[PDB]
């Protein structure tokens, strides 16, 4: 008999199984360890080719969009030209010294821009710029001593010079203020929520009242 079971919805009604008459539609992961070894081998090979430049270019810090993730921070695509301008860098030049540039990203707040400007300033302080001609060094270029002392970043996210993404500091313990002991927080929040929730029907009542006025 059937009995008490979940009603099954396992799909699998297409020609997914490889057999005679069917090529199948499947994807196994038997090459996962070999590809993982290959990726690490390629990364170590690439670091040798680009030595002493960092393997990963510098990336900004951005806030994750959604209200579910807006408390989180992560690396962004590239630094905005407004951020690069505030750090005194031409964006086209910045792309030649391992800085990603993103001209789509806007800066809607000062806090988000300032933290990314700080990252660029820290990067420029630690930057060792090799000269085009070691016998004729121009300004802003490293001497022979620092050139021979150069080391490679090799970080997974390329953030040895600037550190990890910065999170806001946790609030320290304190005492309960006098207003907090008596203020009904639920009433304050509900009133604000109802103002938006019934904004349309409150104005219509008010607008219709003015029609009755005249």
């Amino acid at each position: 008999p059937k009995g008490n079971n979940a009603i099954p919805h396992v799909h699998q009604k297409k020609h997914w199984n490889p057999c005679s008459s069917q090529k199948g539609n499947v994807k196994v992961f038997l090459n996962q360890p070999a590809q993982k070894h290959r990726r690490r081998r390629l990364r170590l090979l690439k670091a040798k080719k680009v030595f002493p430049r960092p393997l990963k270019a510098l990336r900004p810090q951005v806030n994750c969009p959604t209200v579910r993730h807006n408390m989180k921070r992560r690396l962004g695509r590239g630094f905005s030209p407004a951020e690069l301008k505030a750090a005194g860098l031409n964006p086209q030049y910045a792309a030649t010294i391992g800085i990603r540039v993103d001209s789509r990203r806007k800066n809607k707040s000062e806090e988000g821009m300032n933290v990314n400007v700080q990252r660029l300033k820290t990067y420029m302080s630690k930057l060792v710029l090799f000269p085009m001609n070691h016998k004729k060094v121009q300004k802003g270029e490293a001497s022979e001593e620092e050139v021979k002392a150069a080391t490679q970043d090799r970080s997974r996210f390329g953030d040895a010079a600037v550190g990890a993404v910065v999170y806001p500091s946790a609030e320290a313990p304190r005492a309960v203020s006098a207003e907090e002991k008596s203020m009904c927080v639920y009433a304050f929040l509900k009133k604000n929520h109802s103002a938006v929730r019934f904004f349309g029907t409150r104005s219509s009542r008010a607008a219709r009242k003015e029609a009755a006025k005249e």
Partner: protein, 101 residues
């Protein structure tokens, strides 16, 4: 103008975490709303050279006999959009007013 700051709570008219908001930055796409004097002049010269389309002649005659509502319905069927229909009617009203003198 400076954007209105947020109140720091999850609900309300200016809800949201408080930051120091920055004003909208100028963009190269802002000139799309700038009047195009030269493009308008080129269209005027071309329009005078070629005359009126079959739709344009039909709409103009509607406005001559005073059937302004019927002109809008005729434009809407041909153009498929109400915003486009009004502009076509408005252009033909100006053309009718221009031909008076």
């Amino acid at each position: 103008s400076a954007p209105t700051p947020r109140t720091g709570i999850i609900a309300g008219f200016n809800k949201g975490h408080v930051t120091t908001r920055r004003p909208r930055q100028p963009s190269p796409n802002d000139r799309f709303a700038v009047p195009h004097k030269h493009l308008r002049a080129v269209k005027a010269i071309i329009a005078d050279l070629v005359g009126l389309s079959p739709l344009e002649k039909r709409v103009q005659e509607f406005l001559r006999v005073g059937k302004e509502k019927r002109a809008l319905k005729y434009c809407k069927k041909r153009l498929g959009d109400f915003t486009a229909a009004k502009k076509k009617r408005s252009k033909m009203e100006e053309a009718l007013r221009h031909a008076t003198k």
